[PDB]
Design a protein around this ligand. Structure first.
Ligand SMILES: Nc1ncnc2c1ncn2[C@@H]1O[C@H](COP(=O)(O)OP(=O)(O)O)[C@@H](O)[C@H]1O
Ligand SMILES: Nc1ncnc2c1ncn2[C@@H]1O[C@H](COP(=O)(O)OP(=O)(O)O)[C@@H](O)[C@H]1O
Ligand SMILES: Nc1ncnc2c1ncn2[C@@H]1O[C@H](COP(=O)(O)OP(=O)(O)O)[C@@H](O)[C@H]1O
Ligand SMILES: [Mg+2]
Lengths: 430, 427, 436, 427
C-alpha cells in the first residue's frame, strides 16, 4: 500500500474498452489508445498446406487475434462463420458460449502483451475495464476471472470494471447530462447524474452495422454485387461516401435535381475503383440517416425484400428498440427519469462513439448534416420546448472517449475499496 | 517415414504441356522428357522388322532418344504421335492420351533403380496444371496406383503447378504467371492457390512458333516451315521481345544490318534472316505478350494463323487478352483486402518467358520482366509502382523444385480427400 | 520316321535354305540361294537368233534355235561371234535401271533371265516346297515394273516350285546388308549413280539420280582409245570395257594429276593384253588421260572432258524416268548434299553420318606407288565433300562396301528371310509377299 | 526328199588345185583324179587311126588312167596338158580351163551309175577354193546345169574349202590353213568363214618346185630340170623343213654325208643329191613357210626364181609374208572377244604341208606343225602358249568329208541367192 502512490498509478494504470467491434487499450501514459478488432480466428478448419507454414506455437493455441495476424490467414479460411468469432456481436456475450469467452480472454492477453515490464519497480498493472452498459452480471464476473487467470502470465496488481456511458461522462467531466454512445452493434442512451442512472437507460438495436447493411444493398443496386459480398470493402465505402441529411426528403430531391454534384469515386486498391453513378447519388444520404431514423419509405422497401433487417432484441432485462429513432430515444430516457431532475439532465447531451463520426464535405452544408446538427433538428421537430433549452455536442475523439474515461476512473477510484457483487464497484486483486 | 528417408527418396514429377520434368530430391536438377508417346500400330513391316521384339509387344514408346528413332518413318504423324497435354488437360474419353501419361509415369520411375536393400518405396509428388479438373487428379492417382505392382511406391500426392512455383520461390503472397507451350496461366497465391482469381490465356510458346512459321514462308523457306522441329530451333535462336513493338520496328528498319541473323540447323542447312525482314524478329517474342497489332491480324484474316478462345471445363482461355490485363483481371477476381499484398510480387515462370536480350540491344530489345514492367506502366501506373516483377531463376525447373519441397514437407498423417483437394494416397 | 512339317515353309530352318535372291542390275544380274557364299552372276542381256544364216543355224542344237533367244554369259558368247547385226539382236533390257512397258522384247529377256537364274539350282530335298524369292529392283523402277516382275515370276511358277515372291529397292537392300539403319546409299551402276538416304526404309523424297556411270567411263575410254589410234578396237564394246577396267584411274585432284602425268609420262604409261594377239598400250603422250576415265564418274565438268562433248563424240545430259530426273552434269558431292536437303532436318544429322558406296562403278583401286596422285572411290568422295561443304565432311564417315556388286544381293536374301510370310504385298503399302 | 535317201545319194566333189576328190557319201574314202585334162589337139594320122574315134571327137581326155596312156604321144605337154585350177581359181577368159572342169565334173559322175529304180537324182555338194570369186561359183553351177541332161542330178550346192575342213574336223572355232600348189590360204572360222579375216599367200607347192628346179640345175642335171614331172618327184622325195634354217644348214655343211640321198625317177633314171649340195634339201621345205632368207634371195637376184604379190578378185596374195605372220594377221582381222578361241585351234590342210621327217633327223628336221609352232614361238610367244597346232587326219580326204556332211545337213527348202551366198540350185 505504497503501491497506492499517485506517481505509480500515473504510469501503470491500464485501460481496456471492450467495444462491440474494436477494443481500445493501452496504458494511461499514452496520448491516444491502441486499437484492435474484437474478434478471433479459430484455426480448426484450415487446410494442411496452410497449417504447415504456420509457427508451431501458434497452432498450439488454436486461436489467433490482433489485426495484422488475423488478416494473414483470413484469405484461406474454409468456413468464416465457424472460425471468425465476433464475441461481442451486440455489446454482450451469452455466458454458455465458451468460444466467445475464449476470444475475449485471448484479446485481454494480446492487449497486455503489447506493453512489457520495463521498470524494476513495476509491481503490476492497475487494469480498468470498460464494459457495455447492457452487460449482465455474469460478464463482469467472467471478465474478472479472465484477468485473474491472466495474472499468472502478466503482473496484474488490481482489476476494476465500469460501464461505458459512465466512462464517457468521466472523460468529459460531465455531471448532469444525457450520454448517447453510438457503436456498431447498438446505440445506448444513458442519463448521467454523477454516475449512471440505471432506470433511464434506453438502448436501440441499430448502429454502424446497419449503416454497412444499407451501403451493401446500395452496392448491389449500383451493380458491384461481387464487391458487396466482402464485408471489409463495404465498410471502406460507407466511410468514404455516406452522408447524413438535414431532412431526408429535402436532400433526396436536391440530389435528383442535381446528381452531378453528388457523384463520387473511391480508390479501394491500385486495381479496383468504385463509383457512385449519377443515377444513385441520392442514396448516399440513406447510409448516414439509417443510424438516426430507420422509419423511411425507401428503407422499408429493403425490409420487404429479405435484404435488410430492422427489429428488436432482448439482452437480459433490456429491450433494444430496433425502430425507435434517436430523438425519441433521448425523450424516452428523460421520461424514465424523475421530474425534478428532468430539468437539469436535459440541458446537456453528449454524443460519443464511432457511429456518430460523420463529417460534412466542403460546400454541402445546405443538405448534408453534421452529427450534432441532425440531432438538434431531430429534437427541434420532435420536442421543440426541449430543443431550445438543450446544448448538444459530440466529443472530440469519439472512439477514444470511453478509454480516456476508464483510465481516469482507474486512477481516481481509491484502492481501499473492494469490489462487491452487490455494490457493482471497487477493486479485485489477484 | 524417417526424415533421413524423405531427404533421399522424395520424388517429384512435373507433367508439363510439352516437357515432363522428373527425379528424386537428391538431384541438382530434374531429368527432362518430351510429353509425348509414339504408337507403332501403323508402321511398315520393313521398319517393324528392325525393332527389338519386346518393344513392338508394347506398341508404344516414350522418351526423347527412343521416339526420335522411329519418328522419321511414321506414315501419318497425326494418328501415331500423341502429345497428351496439348493444352494442360487430357479429356476423359481419350484412352490413348492416358496410355501415354501412364507410360511416361513408368519411364520416369524406371530411370532410377532400387539400390538400397532398405528402400521400401518412393514418396512421389506429382504437379499437374492448375486447369486439371477432378477426374484428372483421380486418373493420375489410378495410374500411379496401378504402377505400384511394378515399382515400390509407398505414397502419392498431387498439387497444382502455380502453387509449386510459389513454394520453390518461398513466396506466400504473390501472382504466379506460368508460361508454357499451350497456355499462359496467371494464378494469384494467398497461402494456397486462390481459385476464383486464376486467369488463363490461350497463347504460349506454340503461338510464338505459329508466327515464326508464317514469317518463314514469306522469307521463302517454305520447305523448312513445314517441319515443326526446325521452327522451334529458329524461334529460340532468332525471336526477340520489344520494349514497344511499334518503336522497335522503326529501329530495325533504319538499321537492318544490326538485326540480320543466321541459324545453323544441320551440317547442311542454314537459315538466314534477310535485311528486308530483320524487323519481324520482334513479332516472335511479342505475340506471347500482346497479339493486338496490325501486322499480326493480317495473318489471322488469312486462314494461316489462329488467335482464339478455348473452353476447358469451367475455365475460359482468352486468346486475345494481353499479359498485363490478364494480371489486373486476376487481382480483380481476388478479395479486396488482400489485393495489396498478393500483387506486391509478380513471379514469371515457364519457357515461354525465358527470352534473353542479345548483348548490345538493350535499347529496343527487352527481357521478360522488362516487358511486363512496361506493360503494367501503360495499363495501370498506380499498380506498377507497388509491384515487384521478377522471372524465376530456372524457368522450366521451378515447378519441379516446388513439388519435391511439398512432398517432403506435407505430413503423412494427412489423407487425400475429394472435398479437401490435398493429402496422400497409399498403394 | 516323322511326318513332314506342314508349318514347314515358315520354319527358320527351311528359310535358311530356300530363300532366293535375285538382284536385277542394269548390267549384271546377281542371283542365288541364301546358302551360297556369293551370288552367281550373269549379264543382263539376251541374244536373239532370228537373223542368222543357215550355215550357222545348222550347227546349233535344234531346241536352242526353237526358242529364238539365249541368255547366260557362256552361251551368248558362243553364238555372238556369228551374229549379223549386234545392235538389234543383243538386247540389254535394263539399259538404264528400267525397261519401259511398251517393249515386249525387253520383258522377254528379263523373263528368260529369271528362268535361267532358277534353272541353275535344282530340287534336291524331298521336303522342298518352293523357293522364297526376293527380287531387288532399282530405286527408279516404277509400279508397273514391280507388276511385270511379279507376273514373270508368277508365270514361271508352272515351271519351278516357287512358294512366295517379294521385291525391294536396291538402296534399301544395301543398307540391310551393311546393317546400317541411318545412312546415305550411293549406288554406282552402269547406266546411273543413284543416291538414296535411308532412315529405316528408303526416304523417297530424298533420292537423287545422276545420268552417269560405268557407261560414261567406257565412253571416254572409247574416245581416248580413238585418239591414240586404236579405232578398230575402239569400235568393239567388249574391248573398251577391258581397257577401262585395266587403265582408268581416279585423281585426287584432276588438275594436279594431269600436270604430274605430263611432266613424268613414263610413270603413267601402261599396257593391256586383250587376247593372245592384241595388246593395247597407252603411249607417253596420252598417259595423263587415264585420269579422265575415273574422274567422269564423279565430276564431268572439266575442260578436258568437255572437249569430247564439244565434238559430237561424248554425251553428258539429263534424263527423265517417270517422276525422276537424272542429272547428267551434277557431281557426286553435290548429288549427296542435294539429297540430304530433301530430307527432314531432325534426321539429317544421323542420316548423313554414314555414307556407303555400293556398285561396280565405284570399284576403283590405286596402283601401289601412286597414292600421291591417284585416289580410291571413298578418298575421291571425301575430298569432294571437303571442298563442297567442309561443315558436312567433318561429321560424315564415308566407306565403300566390301564386294560392291554382291552387296545388293546379300541384302535381298536377308530381307527375303526376315519378312514374315503372314504379310501380303499391297499395291499401296509397297511391301509384302505374293504367292503363286 | 527323205533322210534315208540323203544318207545314200549325197554326192561330194572337192575341186582341189591338184586332185579332185569325189564320190557319193556311202564311200569309205573318195575316189581321186588329177585336176587336169589332156588335149589331143594334134596328132599324126598313124596315131589318130589307133584311137577310139569317140576319144578323138572330144579332143580332150581326163582321168589319171586315160591321160597316162595318151600322154606318151602328145606333141607339146606344156600347152596340151591343161591344169585348170592351177591356182585355186580359173580365169574367166579361159575357155580351155572351163572345158577341163566341165569334163571332170562329168568323169566324176560317170564313175557312179544309176543302180536303183528309185534313184531320183544326186544331191551334189561342191567345195571350191575360198578365193573362188563370184564367176567361178556361177560357172560351176552352169557346168552342173548343163550336165543335168546327162546324169540324174536333183540338187547342187557349193561351199568354201576352209569351211569344209572345219566341218569335217568338227572344229567350231579354229584357223584352217589350206596349203595349195598355187597359194596358201589362212581362213579363220568362227561358225562360218570370217571373210574379213582370210589372209592369202602367193606361195606353196609351186615355189617348192621352182627352187628344186634351180637346185637341180646347179647340181648339173639340166636336162631333168627342164622337165616338170621330174622336179615334183624330187622335191617330194628329198625336200626337208628345218627346225631353224641357219642351224640346219650348218648341220648339213659340217656333216654332208648324213644328208646325201638318191631318188629313182623311173625304172631307168636315178638322181643323186651330192655332198656339196646336201644342205639345199632344207630350202625346198622352207620356201613354203619363209622365203625371206639370203640363200633363197640369191636365186631371186638372178632372174631364175620369183616371189611376188598377186590379185584374185578381192583378195591380195602376199608373196613374201611368212606363214607365222600370216596367222597373226588373220587373227588381228577377227573380232577381239573371239580372238582367244579362234586362235586356240590351228589346222593344216593341203599337200604343201605333207612333210615328213626322215627317221634319225628329228634334231635338225621338222614336220609341218613343228615348223609352225616354232615360227609362232619366235613371232608371238603370247600366241604360242595358247594355241594348239595340228595336221588333219588324212591330209587330203578332209575337204571332201566335210562337203558330204554339209550337203547332207543343209535344209533343201533353202535356195541359192547371189547376195546371201548359200543354198541349193535345181535344174
Ligand atoms: N470516420 C467514420 N465514419 C463513419 N463511421 C465510422 C467512422 N469511424 C468509425 N466508424 C464506425 O463506428 C463504429 C465503431 O465505434 P466504437 O465506439 O468503437 O463502437 P464499438 O463499441 O462497436 O467498437 C464502427 O461500426 C464503424 O463503422
Ligand atoms: N530459350 C527459349 N526462348 C524462348 N522460348 C523458349 C526457350 N526455351 C523454351 N521455350 C518455350 O517454352 C516452352 C516449354 O517450356 P515449359 O515451361 O517446359 O512448358 P510446359 O508448360 O509445356 O512444360 C516451349 O513452348 C518453348 O517454345
Ligand atoms: N574394276 C572396275 N573399275 C571400274 N568400274 C568397274 C570395275 N568393275 C566393274 N565396274 C563397273 O561396274 C558396273 C557393273 O556393276 P554393278 O554396280 O552391279 O552395276 P549394275 O547394277 O548395272 O549391274 C559396270 O558399269 C562396270 O563398268
Ligand atoms: Mg467503445
Amino acid at each position: 500500500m505504497g503501491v497506492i502512490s499517485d506517481a505509480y498509478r500515473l504510469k501503470y494504470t491500464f485501460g481496456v474498452d471492450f467495444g462491440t467491434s474494436y477494443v481500445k487499450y493501452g496504458p494511461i501514459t499514452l496520448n491516444e489508445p491502441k486499437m484492435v478488432q474484437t474478434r478471433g480466428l479459430f484455426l480448426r478448419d484450415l487446410p494442411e498446406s496452410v497449417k504447415m507454414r504456420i509457427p508451431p506455437d501458434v497452432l498450439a493455441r488454436g486461436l489467433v487475434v490482433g489485426d495484422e495476424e488475423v488478416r494473414k490467414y483470413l484469405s484461406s479460411v474454409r468456413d468464416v462463420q465457424r472460425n471468425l468469432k465476433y464475441p461481442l456481436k451486440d455489446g454482450v456475450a451469452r455466458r454458455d458460449d465458451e468460444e466467445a469467452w475464449r476470444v475475449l480472454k485471448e484479446l485481454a492477453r494480446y492487449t497486455l502483451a503489447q506493453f512489457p515490464v520495463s521498470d524494476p519497480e513495476f509491481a503490476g498493472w492497475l487494469v480498468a475495464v470498460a464494459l457495455s452498459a447492457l452487460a449482465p452480471d455474469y460478464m463482469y464476473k467472467a471478465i474478472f476471472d479472465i484477468y485473474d487467470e491472466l495474472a499468472s502470465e502478466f503482473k496484474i496488481y488490481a482489476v476494476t470494471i465500469l460501464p461505458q456511458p459512465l466512462a464517457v461522462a468521466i472523460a468529459e467531466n460531465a455531471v448532469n447530462c444525457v450520454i448517447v454512445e453510438g457503436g456498431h452493434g447498438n446505440i445506448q442512451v444513458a442519463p448521467i447524474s454523477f454516475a449512471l442512472i440505471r432506470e433511464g437507460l434506453v438502448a436501440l438495436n441499430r448502429g454502424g452495422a446497419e449503416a454497412n447493411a444499407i451501403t451493401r444493398e446500395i452496392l448491389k443496386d449500383i451493380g458491384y454485387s461481387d464487391i458487396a459480398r466482402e464485408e471489409y470493402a463495404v465498410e471502406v465505402v460507407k466511410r468514404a461516401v455516406g452522408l447524413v441529411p438535414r431532412r431526408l426528403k429535402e436532400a433526396i430531391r436536391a440530389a435528383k435535381s442535381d446528381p452531378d454534384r453528388f457523384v463520387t469515386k473511391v480508390r479501394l486498391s491500385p486495381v479496383v475503383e468504385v463509383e457512385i453513378p449519377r443515377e444513385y447519388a441520392w442514396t448516399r444520404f440513406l447510409i448516414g440517416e439509417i443510424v438516426f431514423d430507420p422509419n423511411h419509405e425507401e428503407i422499408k422497401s429493403y425490409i420487404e425484400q429479405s435484404r435488410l433487417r430492422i427489429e428488436n432484441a432482448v439482452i437480459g432485462d433490456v429491450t433494444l428498440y430496433g425502430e425507435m429513432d434517436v430523438a425519441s430515444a433521448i425523450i424516452t430516457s428523460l421520461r424514465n427519469v424523475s421530474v425534478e431532475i428532468q430539468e437539469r439532465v436535459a440541458s446537456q447531451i453528449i454524443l460519443s462513439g464511432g457511429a456518430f463520426s460523420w463529417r460534412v464535405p466542403p460546400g454541402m452544408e445546405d443538405v448534408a448534416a453534421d452529427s450534432v446538427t441532425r440531432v438538434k433538428i431531430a429534437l427541434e421537430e420532435k420536442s421543440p420546448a426541449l430543443a431550445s433549452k438543450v446544448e448538444v455536442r459530440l466529443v472530440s475523439e469519439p472512439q477514444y472517449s470511453v478509454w480516456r474515461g476508464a483510465v481516469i476512473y482507474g486512477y481516481a477510484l481509491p484502492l481501499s475499496l473492494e469490489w462487491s457483487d452487490t455494490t457493482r464497484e471497487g477493486w479485485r486483486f489477484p
